[PDB]
Structures are given as structure tokens and as C-alpha cells.
């Protein structure tokens, strides 16, 4: 690894600088280097890892959607043949996206998940595993698609099972997990009623636990509850 010679603490410091400079590819490369040092990640470090890759893959997904739409338009009746270029470039972006997802999944498998014994860390990583399989599923079309979808589902389900046993219903990781698993159900698994049920139950159980929270915890929990409500409004 190109980051093998840099100190762990220096990689974390540079990830924070990269975030400030909106250099998310660099940020992700630094955090990959930090993970590869082999030690567990603190809460702050887990956030840096997830922010970096979320932004990289988010940009790839946005680009893939633009290109996919152009390609779909080009394959409509009445469209003039433009050659292989749209497909080729969509495939290029797709392959780069798949590569980033595989990289993140590899970090989680070697060895972040297995070394995460506390519920908060294990749930965090299993959420990420569901998310990155979900991004693979968004572009998948081959013999493997059903298995990619099931890998996302299985990771999210294990995270849900641990979070319900070990975390309060207002915990932001538990809430964000449920938000994203609900989106999985709606957009990936073609289970809109499951998505709506999960978002509603999550919102209501968080509402009932807000009274236990400090003002600062309340802010984080209510922000995610508003995203649940936003999705419910979009879907109903």
C-alpha cells in the first residue's frame, strides 16, 4: 500500500485535512491506509472512513445515473444510433464504482467486522457492508444480482438484530441503519410496504425515546427522524 510508510496518526490527520479541502478521494485513500495498520477504529475514525467513501461512491453513483439515463434514451425507438461510446463510458464509470465498493467491502472483511465486538462498532460496519452491497446491486445485471441483493439484506439484517438488542431506539447509528435498510427495501428489494413499515416503526419508537435525551443527542436523533419522515412523504 502506498500509505504503508505513513504513521497511522498522520493518515488520520491528513484525512481530516482532506475533508476540510473536499478532497474525498484523498480522504478515502488516507483512511484505507489507516485501516490497513490493523488496529480498531475509534468512533471518530469510523466516521472519517464512512464519510470519505460515501462521498466518493456518491459522486460515482450520480455520474452513473446520468450516463445510464442517456444510454436508456439512446435505446428508445426513434433514437439515432450513436455507436458504442455511451455504453462504454457508462461501463467505465460502473467498473470504477464496483472497484470502490469492493475496496470498502474488503476493508470490512479484513478485518474490521471480525474485530468489532462492541455493538456500536459492529453495527456501524455491518451497516456499511449493507450499503456497499446495495450500491453494487444498483448496477448489477448478471447471474450474481440476486446474491448481491441477498448479501446486502443479510448484512443489514444482522445489524438490525444487534442494534435492537444492544442500542436505544434513538441511537443515530441504529436510526441511520433503519433509514438505509428501508431504502434498500423500497429501491432494491421491490418491497415498498416493508420499506414504509420499517420507516414508520423506526420513527415512532424513536419519538417515544426522545424524552431520555440531552439536547445534543436530541438534535442528531431528530435530524434522522426527519429523513425517515421525508421518505415516508415521498412514498405515500
Amino acid at each position: 500500500g502506498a500509505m504503508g510508510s505513513m504513521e497511522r496518526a498522520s493518515l488520520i490527520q491528513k484525512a481530516k485535512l482532506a475533508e476540510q479541502a473536499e478532497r474525498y478521494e484523498d480522504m478515502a485513500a488516507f483512511m484505507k491506509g489507516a485501516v490497513e495498520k490493523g488496529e480498531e477504529l475509534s468512533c471518530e475514525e469510523r466516521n472519517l472512513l464512512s464519510v470519505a467513501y460515501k462521498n466518493v461512491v456518491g459522486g460515482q453513483r450520480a455520474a452513473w445515473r446520468v450516463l445510464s439515463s442517456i444510454e436508456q434514451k439512446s435505446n428508445e425507438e426513434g433514437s439515432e444510433e450513436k455507436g458504442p461510446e455511451v455504453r462504454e463510458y457508462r461501463e467505465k464509470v460502473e467498473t470504477e464504482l464496483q472497484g470502490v465498493c469492493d475496496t470498502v467491502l474488503g476493508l470490512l472483511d479484513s478485518h474490521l467486522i471480525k474485530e468489532a465486538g462492541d455493538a456500536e462498532s459492529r453495527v456501524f460496519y455491518l451497516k456499511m457492508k449493507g450499503d456497499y452491497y446495495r450500491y453494487l446491486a444498483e448496477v448489477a445485471t448478471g447471474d450474481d444480482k440476486k446474491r448481491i441483493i441477498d448479501s446486502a439484506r443479510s448484512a443489514y439484517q444482522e445489524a438490525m438484530d444487534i442494534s435492537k438488542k444492544e442500542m436505544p431506539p434513538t441511537n443515530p447509528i441504529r436510526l441511520g441503519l433503519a433509514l438505509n435498510f428501508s431504502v434498500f427495501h423500497y429501491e432494491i428489494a421491490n418491497s415498498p410496504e416493508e420499506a414504509i413499515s420499517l420507516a414508520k416503526t423506526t420513527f415512532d419508537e424513536a419519538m417515544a425515546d426522545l424524552h431520555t435525551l440531552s439536547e445534543d443527542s436530541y438534535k442528531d436523533s431528530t435530524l434522522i427522524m426527519q429523513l425517515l419522515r421525508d421518505n415516508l412523504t415521498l412514498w405515500t
Binding site: 441511520g176 431504502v183 429501491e187 429523513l227 421525508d230 412514498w235
Partner: peptide
């Protein structure tokens, strides 16, 4: 697109 975090 729906919200995720």
C-alpha cells in the same frame, strides 16, 4: 431519490 445517511 430517497434519503440515506
Amino acid at each position: 431519490f430517497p434519503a440515506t445517511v
